[PDB]
Amino acid sequence: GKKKVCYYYDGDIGNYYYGQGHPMKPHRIRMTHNLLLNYGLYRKMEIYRPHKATAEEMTKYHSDEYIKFLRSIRPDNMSEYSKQMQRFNVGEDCPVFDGLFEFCQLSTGGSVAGAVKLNRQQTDMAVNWAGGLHHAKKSEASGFCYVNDIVLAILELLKYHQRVLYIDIDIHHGDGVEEAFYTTDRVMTVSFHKYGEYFPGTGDLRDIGAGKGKYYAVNFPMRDGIDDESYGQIFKPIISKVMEMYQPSAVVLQCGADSLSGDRLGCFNLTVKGHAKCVEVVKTFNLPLLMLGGGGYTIRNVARCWTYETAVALDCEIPNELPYNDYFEYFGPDFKLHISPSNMTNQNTPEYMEKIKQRLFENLRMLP
């Protein structure tokens, strides 16, 4: 039936600025929050302010040297760390900005706090839209991500769960998460993503894991222009087969909104309803679920997406007419919650979708 939802948000998040022209806008988390508050969704869920995750918490995955660097680097001392910046991939796509470490701490704190709450059986779902930074690696920033809150939250879940399922609907391959768990069967990682000379360049369907983790990494490579129909063709069948074969006891769902139609960086054509169908599918399995944010560069659509997916988590129907809010002008000219797909060509034929699905089903037969 209906579930208990705990939601994590820190009002300071929207103030972190990656710099002039950088497409990552933490302000989108505040727009999301303000919109869902204006729909009255706070009446149906517990709202918590995450703690600032410490260096002890972050070094459960990341190296001491990389976390020490992130704690130290500032725009004022940048000149003195030119060598370290190159070593850790900080300074270009992953810039040094005021309060960078605090931004890492808040984004991470919500995911780890959500995992603790699920481990304690105090909630059915935990939501952290400021999380989902799937590209960060053990000792390296990547793709605007510095600290991998997802890996840390999964490590927290593994204290009480033998098997954790990770599902990733961001347009990009969930490389940092897949890499962290590549050689274990205790986490199965399932990523659906644009593939073919696209960032980060990994996630071929032939990448299936290694050693004990062989068959525990699943990749569904897609072409430009995927629509609700095509995505819906394959998501429920793959997740259903994964649930059947893997039998996880907890799930982490990365809800990156860069897979929506009209994304500034992305090349997919999903609506908010098509993207949210993924949350509905996963929610149906009735397992402890951690829902996380991710990419998303057309900020008005990110706020619509995560507001609607919070409503889905709550089994709460909300009107398409947007309520007034602090960012009302961002939603023009329509001022509606739902979006239309564009006329872009879907390069993913129905045969291609079915064929990749069949190849993944062959791999899933290899589980015990």
Ligand SMILES: CC(=O)Nc1ccc(C(=O)Nc2cc(-c3cccs3)ccc2N)cc1
């Ligand atoms: C050349 C090129 O295309 N570069 C590039 C573009 C987009 C992304 C991205 O979408 N990154 C991301 C960031 C986050 C972050 C969330 C919060 C802070 S960063 C979460 C998920 C993804 N996929 C990464 C790299």
Ligand SMILES: [Ca+2]
């Ligand atoms: Ca993905």
Ligand code: NA
């Ligand atoms: Na794995």
Ligand SMILES: [Zn+2]
């Ligand atoms: Zn992305």
